Amino acid sequence: RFXXX
Amino acid sequence: AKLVCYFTNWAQYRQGEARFLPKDLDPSLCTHLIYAFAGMTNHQLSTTEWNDETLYQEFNGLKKMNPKLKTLLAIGGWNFGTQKFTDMVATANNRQTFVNSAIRFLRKYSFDGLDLDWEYPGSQGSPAVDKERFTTLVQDLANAFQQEAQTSGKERLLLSAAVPAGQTYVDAGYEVDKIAQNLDFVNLMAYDFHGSWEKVTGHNSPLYKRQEESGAAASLNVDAAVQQWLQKGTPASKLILGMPTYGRSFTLASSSDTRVGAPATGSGTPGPFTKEGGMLAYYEVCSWKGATKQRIQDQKVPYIFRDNQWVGFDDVESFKTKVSYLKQKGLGGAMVWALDLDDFAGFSCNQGRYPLIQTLRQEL
Structure with a gap:
């Protein structure tokens, strides 16, 4: 988050 | 109280002491272990790593050591995206295909339930109608799991969902009062509140606001x-408070300005083992030599900085504070992302194995 995840 | 812990199936690929295998799992550490992640193929539940089936056996095999332990398989995650979920919930036939496949798959590999981790319905590529289609999916799974328990006599498969903390994502995809009645528990992702995607430093998981924030x-x-x-609308007993065993890092515009809210230029340096700029496992920040650790007084969490590197993370003290908090709020327990980011092998923090998660177990 929030594409790296 | 529940202590819900996520296992990730890519941690097996890290190097040295960071490598995490089911052998590093403690059968009595958590009450519920969730396997991240499963995906979908042709609207049917499927594995995502080449050796998942072998790992599933080892994972669910832990129940022979601790009969009270429950396991669930999580479908989705951030990298999985939204398209496959959108396509599956689009029609009654695709929802049926998925639901039937899930029961069969969960029973085949001896999982006790399913954790929905769509990130997220109604945003990130998923249209607005997916908010109500997600509600329908949750009802479909709940209905099916209840029916299978009635017809088979087996203990009902559990249904949970990992949900966002951000108001925008919550408003875009979740009919909270509706899905909460069908879910056995709600894994609140109470982290990622701040990160290198912002232009100033901020803590990954602060308990309260800073005086300056409005x-x-x-x-x-x-x-x-x-x-x-x-x-x-979420019953307190069903709300499980998520806790991060990782921190979010930043590169400071100036090593001379290290407060919370100080100018930042981007992600912090990737950790030696996690190799993902912007985040560090607890074992990657707990032993910094030459660093300065401080606590954000009104937010009740720590951060540490050295030179132009700044990271907000959680320690034993903040985890204790957060458990006191969840108890006072009457919540159902704690959830942790993730087993492999705590110092699971006790090789770095000088606090033994699973220092953070063991704290949750003891405090709960």
Whole structure:
């Protein structure tokens, strides 16, 4: 988050 | 109280002491272990790593050591995206295909339930109608799991969902009062409140707001997120408070300015083992030599900085504070992302194995 995840 | 812990199936690929295998799992550490992640193929539940089936056996095999332990398989995650979920919930036939496949798959590999981790319905590529289609999916799974228990005599498969803390994502995809009645528990992702995607430093998981924050910013904390999910209809007993065993890092514009809210230029240096700029496992920040650790007084969490590197993370003390908090709020327990990011092998923090998660177990 929030594409790296 | 529940202690819900996520296992990730890519941690087996890290090097040295960071490598995590089911052998590193403690059968009595958590009450519920969730396997991240499963995906989908042709609207049917499927594995995502080449050796998952072998790992599933080892994972669910832990129940022979601790009969009270329950396991669930999580479908989705951030990298999985939204398209496959959107396509599956689009029609009654695709939802049926998925639901039937899930029961069969969960029973085949001896999982006790399913954790829905769509990130997220109604945003990130998923249209607005997916908010109500997600509600239908949750009803479909709940209905099916109840029916299978009635017809088979087996203990009913559990259904949970990992949900966002951000008001925008919550408003875009979740009919909270509706899905909460069908879910056995709600895994609130009470983290990622701040990160290198912002232009100033901020803590990954602060318990409360900073005095200086107001408006939308005042909702970027654990307490605000919990109050939101409870206010919108989640029974407190079903709300499980997520806890991060990792921190979020930043590169400071100036090593001379290290406060919370100081100018930042981007992600912090990738950790030696996790190799992902912007985040560090607890074992990657707990032993910094030459660093300066401080606690954000009103937010009740720590951060540490050295030179132009700054990282907000959670320690034993903040985890104790957060458990006191969840108890006072009457929540159902704690959830942790993730087993492999705590110092599971006790090789770095000088606090033994699983220092953070063991703290949750003892405090709960």
